[PDB]
Each structure stands twice: as C-alpha cells, then as structure tokens.
RNA sequence: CUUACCACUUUGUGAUUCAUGACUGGGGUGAAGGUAACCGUAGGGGAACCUGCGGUUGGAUCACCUCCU
RNA sequence: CGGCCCCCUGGACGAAGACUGACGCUCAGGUGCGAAAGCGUGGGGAGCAAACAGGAUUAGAUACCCUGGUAGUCCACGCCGUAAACGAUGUCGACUUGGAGGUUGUGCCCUUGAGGCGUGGCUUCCGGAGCUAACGCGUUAAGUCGACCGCCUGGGGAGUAC
RNA sequence: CCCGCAGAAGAAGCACCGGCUAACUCCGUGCCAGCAGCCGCGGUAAUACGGAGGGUGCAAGCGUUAAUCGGAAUUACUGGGCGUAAAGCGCACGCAGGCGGUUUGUUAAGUCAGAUGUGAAAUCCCCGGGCUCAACCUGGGAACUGCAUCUGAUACUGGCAAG
RNA sequence: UAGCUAGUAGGUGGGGUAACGGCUCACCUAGGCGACGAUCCCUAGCUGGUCUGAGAGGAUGACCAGCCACACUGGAACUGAGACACGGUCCAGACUCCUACGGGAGGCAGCAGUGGGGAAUAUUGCACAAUGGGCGCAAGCCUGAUGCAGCCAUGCCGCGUG
C-alpha cells in the first residue's frame, strides 16, 4: 500500500539515528552476472531503539537532517 | 569441488555418447529426471530409469541412427557462474528450430516451443540439436 | 677531431664556388644514419632547385674522393633563420644580431650565453649577455648559432 | 577472463594515438618554412629528397616534404602542409599542398593537374 | 556613528604546480686465443668479457630469378 | 631431502567399521615458506675457491696454465625474497579407448613358498579417439566440462625512468 | 505556375588505367629522376616515372587531407588467448569476495506472466497524404527494449525451516 | 590520488526560510564516510539523439527540441510573483573612452559588422503580410523573435548540357 523498503542496520552509534545498508540484486549491464549493490542510507530511528546488525523495515518521509530523509516503520527480526 | 550437477550430467552424455557407450549413469535428482525425461519425451534419448533405495542412480538409454549418435551438440547455457533468463517473446532458437532448448518455466520445465505456446519465460537450461 | 674536414672543405670548395655559390656550414656526424650537412649561403635565394644543381655537382666530385669514415649522406642546406655561424666574417655581417654560443671545456660561469653581437675580432667576439657586452673566445667555442627574435 | 574478473576490471579499449600530431585534427595547417635542404640517399642510389624545415603557426616546428619540381621556395616562405607520409624517408609525416598561395605551382604538367594546381591549359 | 560578515589587497609563511632556464641521471654513441647455449648472484672492472656458487636444455648456423582459367 | 642411533614432531596410504551432517571449492587484499649468491654479529676453519699473488706467454701481457690464495663455502642469530624457483603446463571436481612398466597397500584361493585370482595409492612409458599452428598431448590430457584466481595484447624502447 | 518566342541553339569535368581494383599501348626517360596508401616501381624496353593515343570510373563535380566507426574475433558480453609464438604469481594458508551436494516445507527476493502508469515532440520504422518527381513536408501507427506499481506463477536461483 | 571529515555525522534549543533541513546559532554527543573507490588531481555542459556497425557495441552532443550554467573580471544585494537580474543597481579591478584633468562613461557569448585568431565559415537586407510574444477595451504600437531575401557546390535531391 505504501512504498516501504527493508534493510540491515550497519550502525546505531548515532543518537536517535541508524545507518542502514540495504541490498539490491541486479542484472549487470554488459555481462549479466547479478551483483549485490548496497547504499549507506542514513535513517531516522526514534528511541535509539534498534541495535547494530538488526534487520528492519524503513519508509521515506520529509527530509529531517542534512543526510536523513527516511524513518523506520517497524523492525522485522531482533535479538541479533 | 563439484559445483554443478547438470553440467556433469550433460558431459557424461556428451563424453558418454562420445565413447559410443550404451547408457551412462549418474546420481539422480529432481531437475535431472525432470531434464532427462524431456529428452526421451522429445526423442533425444531411448529411455531412462532410477535404481537403488536411499541411493540415487539414473541409468538412461542413449540411441544411434545409421551408426551415428542421435545427439551431436549439447551445451549448458545457464551456468552456476552466470544465470540466464529469457522472456517468452525472446526464447531462443536452436539450428532454426531443428534443435530443442530446455527452459525451466515457472509452471514446469519444458521445451521452448511448448513454452512459446504456453507464453511463458524461463531459465534456459541448455541446448541440444 | 677534424676528419680531414679542411681537406673535405677543399674538396667541396671547388664545386660550391664552381657553380658560383657561397660556402658556409661544414658539419658531419657519424652514427646510425651517419650524415653531413653542407650549407649554401645564396644571396639570390636558396631554392632547392638551385641546391639541386650544386648537389649533383658535389656528389659527382665526392665519389672519386670519397671521405674517410664519412658515409654518402650530404645535406645541401639553406642556412635557416637559426643558421650556425663559426667564422668572424659572419658576425661581421651579423653585425648586431643575437647568437647562442656553447663551448667544449664547460666550467662554472662558462661562455654558454645568448646575446647580440656588438664587435668582432679574429679569435674573439663581443656579445651582449648578462646585460653587458662580454668577451667570447671562439677558440674553445665548438658550436654557435645565429638567433632570430621569436616567441 | 571470467566475467567475475571483468566486473572487477572490464576490457580496456585499446587506446590509439593519431599519426599526424602537428596537425591537431585540422585538415591543413599553414606554417612558415625555416630552412630547405636536400639530402642524399645512401651509396647505391643518388637522389635529392626535397624536404624543408617549417615552424607551424602553433610553434610545432617540423619538416615537410616538397613534392614536384620548379618550386621557388626558400626561407621565410609561408606554405601550407597537409596529412600523409613518405615510407622511404623517416621523420617526415607531413607534405605541403602544391599550388599553395606562397608556392609556385609545378610548371609544364599536363596530367594529374588537380594535385598541383596546374590550371586547365587555355585550349 | 559603531558591531559582525566579507570582495579586492598586503604581509610573511608554505604546498601544488605550469612555463622559462643555468646546471646532471642515461637509449644510441665518432692480435696469445677458446667458442654448447643460457638463468640468479658476487667479484674482477672502461664496461664488456671471464671467473665464483647454484640452477636449466630451450644441447646449429645459413638460404634471393613465373601461369591461365 | 642421503652414514648410524636416540629424542621431538608433521603428512600420506590401506583394511574394516563407527561417527558427525554440506561443516565444501577458490582466493584480490593478506600473512608464510622459500636454491645459490650476498649482508649484519659472533663463530669456526680441513678441503675447495671469487678476488688477489706468483710462475709461465705476441702491437701488450693480457687471456690461456700452473702454484698460491682471501672472502666465501660451515655454525649461531639476524637480513635479503630472486633463479630456465621449469613439467616453460594455477587450483578443485567430474567424465572419457588401450598396452607396458615401477612402486606401496590389501582381500581371496590354490598346498603354500611360489603361483593363481583380486582390489587400492603413487609413479614411469607407449599409444587410441580427441585436441593442437605444428611439434605434440593423450585417464597423471595440452581431451570432453565445471568453479575461482592469476595473466597477455606488434618488436624495440623496458621490466628501464619517475 | 501557365502561355508565347526564336534557335542546337547558352551550358563537362576530375580521377585513374603494376598488384590490391574496373580499365594498355607509344615515345620519352636514364636510376636522371621521379612515383608513391603499401607491396613495390625505373634504366636501355619502364603497361608503375614524363608525354601521346586508347580505356575505366564518376560526374557539376572529381580528387587529396583531416576525422570517427567499420573492416579489427585487434580488449573477443555476444566473440580471444596463456606447454614452446605475448601471457599460470616460487609455493602454500587464508579474510573479504565468488561459487556450492541432496530432500521436504515455507517464503516470494531473484525470475516469469499479466495489468496500470510512465517512457515529451521531433528523429527512426511501417502504412499513407502533399509538394509535377524526388529530396522535403505531413497523417496514423509501430517502436521508445526502460522505470514504477498492482496482480500473479513457483520450475530454477535465493531466503527461511527441517532433514 | 587511500584515507577523508569538527558544523564535520547525528541530538536539543533558538533563530532563520514560501517550505524541509547544520539553513544558522547555542549547546549536546563523537560520530559519519572509503577498496560497492572516498579523497585528490586532471578532462568535460547533460539528454532526446547523431555517426558507425548485421548486431552487441563504439564514437558523438554541430543544427532542431528538453534541461543546466554563464552575461568584462570579482562581490553584493535591491525591487519584484518570479532576479541576486545579458541591453537593472552598487563596490572592487582591468581595459577603453571623455575631460575644464576636477572627474566622468563603458561592456556585441542580441542582429548585422570590424579588428584579430585561424585550414576555414555569410548581408552593417526587407517586412512586421503570416505565426508568435508585449502593452492596450480596442484601434493600434513595439518586436534583428519570426517571416523573407543576400552570400557561399557546404550537403541532399531533381534537371539539363540535345
Ligand atoms: Mg638534378
Ligand atoms: Mg630445480
Ligand atoms: Mg651461502
Ligand atoms: Mg682470464
Ligand atoms: Mg658471513
Ligand atoms: Mg621471476
Ligand atoms: Mg588440464
Ligand atoms: Mg600518378
Ligand atoms: Mg572489435
Ligand atoms: Mg590471440
Ligand atoms: Mg622464447
Ligand atoms: Mg613465451
Ligand atoms: Mg570467502
Ligand atoms: Mg551463497
Ligand atoms: Mg544447490
Ligand atoms: Mg517520441
Ligand atoms: Mg515524422
Ligand atoms: Mg505523392
Ligand atoms: Mg529452495
Ligand atoms: Mg531546529
Ligand atoms: Mg548543445
Ligand atoms: Mg550550433
Ligand atoms: Mg521582494
Ligand atoms: Mg535584463
Ligand atoms: Mg550587449
Ligand atoms: Mg555578432
Ligand atoms: Mg587570419
Ligand atoms: Mg524599435
Ligand atoms: Mg546547388
């Protein structure tokens, strides 16, 4: 219903923030070997709730910092 | 280590019928029998069978016409190294349709001619003339 | 050392003054494609066609008197804007023109300078480098070329 | 080799430099001759390779081959060179264009008159 | 009228460079004989070559004068 | 890697099970090993021997030969990290005619020695199809395939300059 | 644009002709020279240089140069190699990475199918229309291989679970 | 070119903006970013497309259309819906220009055109009849947009030279 995207958390050290590395797997333009491409997306995490290495769902919102334009809807797994 | 059954299934046929053997055996698996039957079900091999309990053995019967191997060129196209998928409109041709291409469509593994009739795209397993 | 260069100059002097032309610029260098360059200072104009008449004349005399350790690679040459001048007749005619001079036994503050000629002596030249006219002894100078003003 | 290597490092397209640098892609580049000279071929052959020394407008000083005969050029002549090279003489990658404004066109030519500016004979 | 900002500037202080240009690392350079080739290294030293050690076989040189279906 | 013996220890192979349960393969970067020569310090010191020394021998002895002979060669501990370090053939797997061998296992059975049957590992040599430019390679493939890495792009310049 | 007028009347050239490549003789010529994109050409005979005839090719142009792609499988994705021709690191271990036996279940990421949205017009291409033809202009379409979303499908890959 | 970074990565609070926001401040934290190539230097307007190629590709960004940036050089805002404004303002600079020497003026990368550069590229044209745009009720006015002409074998296509 809403555009949403899931990623693993590279880091949570940031106060009230998380660094999320999301993986997207693609046909390759010349050859055709599908290679993983990752983005160091800055994500707003309230509560400083998540933990480093967790898997988590994320949705975009109005920009909120110099680098953070996304906020987390919910977490999928836990207890990493 | 071994990293592909199908390739080893194929060459075993190729090198097998190269030595003009009668029937070549290899450990069974779903894809294999799925693959293997399509040959006979197309006429590429005489017949096949599975033997043993808790042990996988596939023994398929080759065929020769006028002292000549019935299959002549068999190439695994989608490889464990690089995977290959083709949309229905774009399913290739082998020797201008004289050859058959094995395509794993979502509904079932089948011949590309049937896949075009089914209007379905799939992973191109291999070629055979 | 002069490889009989004076003898070669005498051998090629007769043809150059034979068709009347005027001799400057004797040079030879052995090596890969060993070659010698002969310059004709034609006042009328050094056309390669005028050079052509001199070149057949000098080759015909040269074959009978082939030079020692010198190959048949003569360059009948117009003395270009940067023609090299060695005699005091040149600097004499080259009254107030600049020249770049390099010498054999290089030393700290050697006469490797480029400047305008102000006076001419048989063994010495006065040439304005360092912002002052200075004595140059062509005795140790084995290479020197007249320079046009350029960018 | 293995595509996994190509994705690490793809096929570098083999670079290829031009064989006529003093042109800078301009199909012709005028320059002023600086000294003309003929040179002698080795012992077996006697010939007058007619080539001249020319500084280009852009300071690229080079030599240019002088084709034909009857040319009245000498130092300070302001000629126009063009692409092409002669296999026999090394170091010559450019030839002038016969019939250039400074050049006097080769006289008495009744064939191939476009390659020398020899105008159609009035006849 | 004064405060902050800041162009230009100036001072030095460097770096990165771009040329000009005095000067210097280096591709080409103007016979008594004993002969498989080589590789790594050391020394002789103009250098090369030979020698020292260890290793390899890759254990030979050379070549120029016309036809239609 | 080469006397004998002891002490310390790594790896391979076979037989027969039992055991875990895909725990695997490759490897940029990365560490490590790494002939000879050389270097540092200390050794040591027979033989051998660069260099050197002498004797013999032409523009000139020089080279060639003798007779010496230092470093070195050895040890200890450092350093160097290159060799035609080559099978000029990356690693792992699977498949595909044969004959001859060597070598180390081990089953069976003759009366066992022997001998007969087997069945493993390593290794040598021919040679089939195959492949290869050819030479050749040819179940230890340079054959038929797979997975991954390294690597090549005219010769010289140059494995040089920076 | 049409009508009239007079009269063949006002209107052809460049390149090449040894090979590659269509098109050949004659005299010059004396290594003089020239010619050259290369291989090569040249002496007493030169179809390769100069000239004449003759011929080829194009054509109001014809040539030369530059320049890019092609040819070039000559960076080889399609589509190359590495015993000796250039090319397997001296050898090993090993992180990252790449890849992965077999069975069932789940997932739907890959993938596939469909749909919707978008992918400007021109350009290209098809079928036309209009300029007397053509170029040119123009109608309609196709195409724009993409992207996003929704629905799907589950063989394979992946994930998850158990083997 | 392997590290890069302190308003730097984030947080609170305030201010600030049409609006989000280190936009900016105050403080708080000490992060963030890089071999999935940061950083740096060097080169370059981008796209629809164009050229080449059987294709994949490769090369390209002249004309036309979309977007961006720039308007002597540097800096600044003002006004306005919209500008940090090509034929607007101010400051600095260079240059040119005027001068009474005290000061002033100026910006063709609009259209023509000159000089220069260069192998090389055109008219100091006509008209606002058409389409457009401005202002205006309109009439109409303005428009080097545009429509046309001139120049040039620059190209394509057509035709003639019987
Ligand atoms: Mg002559
Ligand atoms: Mg060895
Ligand atoms: Mg040693
Ligand atoms: Mg000696
Ligand atoms: Mg020592
Ligand atoms: Mg090596
Ligand atoms: Mg092999
Ligand atoms: Mg000709
Ligand atoms: Mg190619
Ligand atoms: Mg090759
Ligand atoms: Mg060799
Ligand atoms: Mg080799
Ligand atoms: Mg790994
Ligand atoms: Mg995996
Ligand atoms: Mg699997
Ligand atoms: Mg369109
Ligand atoms: Mg159209
Ligand atoms: Mg029509
Ligand atoms: Mg699965
Ligand atoms: Mg705030
Ligand atoms: Mg543009
Ligand atoms: Mg333009
Ligand atoms: Mg305002
Ligand atoms: Mg304005
Ligand atoms: Mg203006
Ligand atoms: Mg203008
Ligand atoms: Mg000019
Ligand atoms: Mg007006
Ligand atoms: Mg025309």
UniProtKB/Swiss-Prot annotation, chain A:
One of its GO terms (cellular component) is cytosolic small ribosomal subunit. Disulfide bonds: none annotated. One of its GO terms (molecular function) is small ribosomal subunit rRNA binding. Keywords: Antibiotic resistance, Ribonucleoprotein, Ribosomal protein, RNA-binding, rRNA-binding. SUPFAM superfamilies: Nucleic acid-binding proteins. The keyword rRNA-binding applies. Transmembrane segments: none annotated. GO terms for biological process: cytoplasmic translation; response to antibiotic; ribosomal small subunit assembly. The keyword DNA repair does not apply. The strain missing both S17 and L29 grows very slowly and has a rather unstable temperature-sensitive phenotype. Belongs to the universal ribosomal protein uS17 family. One of the primary rRNA binding proteins, it binds specifically to the 5'-end of 16S ribosomal RNA. Also plays a role in translational accuracy; neamine-resistant ribosomes show reduced neamine-induced misreading in vitro. Part of the 30S ribosomal subunit. This is Small ribosomal subunit protein uS17. The gene is rpsQ.
Swiss-Prot record, chain B:
It comes from the Bacteria. Keywords: Repressor, Ribonucleoprotein, Ribosomal protein, RNA-binding, rRNA-binding, Translation regulation. GO terms for cellular component: cytoplasm; cytosol; cytosolic small ribosomal subunit. SUPFAM superfamilies: Ribosomal protein S8. GO terms for molecular function: rRNA binding; structural constituent of ribosome. PROSITE patterns: RIBOSOMAL_S8 (PS00053). InterPro entries: Ribosomal_uS8, Ribosomal_uS8_CS, Ribosomal_uS8_sf. One of its GO terms (biological process) is regulation of translation. One of the primary rRNA binding proteins, it binds directly to 16S rRNA central domain where it helps coordinate assembly of the platform of the 30S subunit. Protein S8 is a translational repressor protein, it controls the translation of the spc operon by binding to its mRNA. Part of the 30S ribosomal subunit. Contacts proteins S5 and S12. Belongs to the universal ribosomal protein uS8 family. This is Small ribosomal subunit protein uS8.
Swiss-Prot record, chain C:
The keyword Methyltransferase does not apply. This is Ribosome maturation factor RimP. InterPro entries: Ribosome_maturation_RimP, RimP_C, RimP_C_sf, RimP_N, RimP_N_sf. It comes from Escherichia coli (strain K12). Disruption phenotype: Cells lacking this gene show a reduced growth rate, especially at high temperatures. They show a reduced amount of 70S ribosomes engaged in translation and a corresponding increase in the amount of free ribosomal subunits. Required for maturation of 30S ribosomal subunits, probably at a late stage of ribosomal protein binding, while Era is associated and after RimM. One of its GO terms (cellular component) is cytosol. GO terms for biological process: ribosomal small subunit assembly; ribosomal small subunit biogenesis; translation.
UniProtKB/Swiss-Prot annotation, chain D:
The keyword Metal-binding does not apply. Keywords: Acetylation, Antibiotic resistance, Methylation, Ribonucleoprotein, Ribosomal protein, RNA-binding, rRNA-binding, tRNA-binding. One of its GO terms (molecular function) is misfolded RNA binding. GO terms for cellular component: cytoplasm; cytosol; cytosolic small ribosomal subunit; ribosome. With S4 and S5 plays an important role in translational accuracy. Interacts with and stabilizes bases of the 16S rRNA that are involved in tRNA selection in the A site and with the mRNA backbone. Located at the interface of the 30S and 50S subunits, it traverses the body of the 30S subunit contacting proteins on the other side and probably holding the rRNA structure together. The combined cluster of proteins S8, S12 and S17 appears to hold together the shoulder and platform of the 30S subunit. Part of the 30S ribosomal subunit. Contacts proteins S8 and S17. Interacts with ArfA. May interact with IF1 in the 30S initiation complex. NCBIfam families: rpsL_bact (TIGR00981). This is Small ribosomal subunit protein uS12. The lineage of its organism: Bacteria, Pseudomonadati, Pseudomonadota, Gammaproteobacteria, Enterobacterales.
């Amino acid at each position: 219903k809403i555009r949403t995207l899931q990623g693993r958390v590279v880091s949570d050290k940031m106060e009230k923030s998380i660094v999320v590395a999301i993986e997207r797997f693609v046909k390759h333009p010349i050859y055709g070997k599908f290679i993983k491409r990752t983005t160091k997306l800055h994500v707003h995490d309230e509560n400083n709730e998540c933990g480093i290495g967790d898997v988590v769902e994320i949705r975009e919102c109005r920009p909120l910092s110099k680098t953070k334009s996304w906020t987390l809807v919910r977490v999928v797994e836990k207890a990493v | 280590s071994m990293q592909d059954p199908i390739a080893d299934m194929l060459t075993r046929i190729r090198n097998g019928q190269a030595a003009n053997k009668a029937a070549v055996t290899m450990p069974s698996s779903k894809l294999k029998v799925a693959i293997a039957n399509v040959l006979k079900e197309e006429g590429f091999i005489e017949d096949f069978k599975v033997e043993g309990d808790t042990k996988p053995e596939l023994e398929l019967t080759l065929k020769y016409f006028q002292g000549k191997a019935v299959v002549e060129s068999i190439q695994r196209v989608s490889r464990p190294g690089l995977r290959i998928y083709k949309r229905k409109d774009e399913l290739p041709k082998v020797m201008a349709g004289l050859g058959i291409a094995v395509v794993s469509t979502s509904k079932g593994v089948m011949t590309d001619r049937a896949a075009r009739q089914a209007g379905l795209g799939g992973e191109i397993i291999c070629y055979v003339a | 050392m002069s490889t009989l260069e004076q003898k070669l100059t005498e051998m090629i002097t007769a043809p150059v003054e034979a068709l009347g032309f005027e001799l400057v610029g004797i040079e030879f260098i052995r090596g890969r494609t060993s070659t010698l360059r002969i310059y004709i200072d034609s006042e009328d104009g050094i056309n390669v066609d005028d050079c052509a008449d001199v070149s057949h004349q000098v080759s015909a005399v040269l074959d009978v008197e082939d030079p020692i350790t010198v190959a048949y690679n003569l360059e009948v040459s117009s003395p270009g804007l940067d023609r090299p001048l060695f005699t005091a007749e040149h600097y004499a005619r080259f009254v107030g023109e600049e020249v770049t001079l390099v010498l054999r036994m290089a030393v700290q503050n050697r006469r490797k300078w480029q400047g305008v000629i102000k006076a001419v002596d048989g063994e010495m030249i006065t040439v304005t480098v360092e912002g002052k006219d200075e004595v140059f002894a062509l005795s140790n100078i084995q290479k020197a070329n007249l320079v046009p003003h350029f960018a | 080799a293995t595509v996994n290597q190509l994705v690490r490092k793809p096929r570098a397209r083999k670079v290829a430099k031009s064989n006529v640098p003093a042109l800078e892609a301009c199909p012709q580049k005028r320059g002023v001759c600086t000294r003309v000279y003929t040179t002698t071929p080795k012992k077996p052959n006697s010939a007058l390779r007619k080539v001249c020394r020319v500084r280009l407008t852009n300071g690229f000083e080079v030599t240019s081959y002088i084709g034909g005969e009857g040319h009245n050029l000498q130092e300070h002549s302001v000629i126009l060179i063009r692409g092409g090279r002669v296999k026999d003489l090394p170091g010559v990658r450019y030839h002038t264009v016969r019939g250039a404004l400074d050049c006097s066109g080769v006289k008495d030519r009744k064939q191939a008159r476009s390659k020398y500016g020899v105008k159609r004979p009035k006849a």
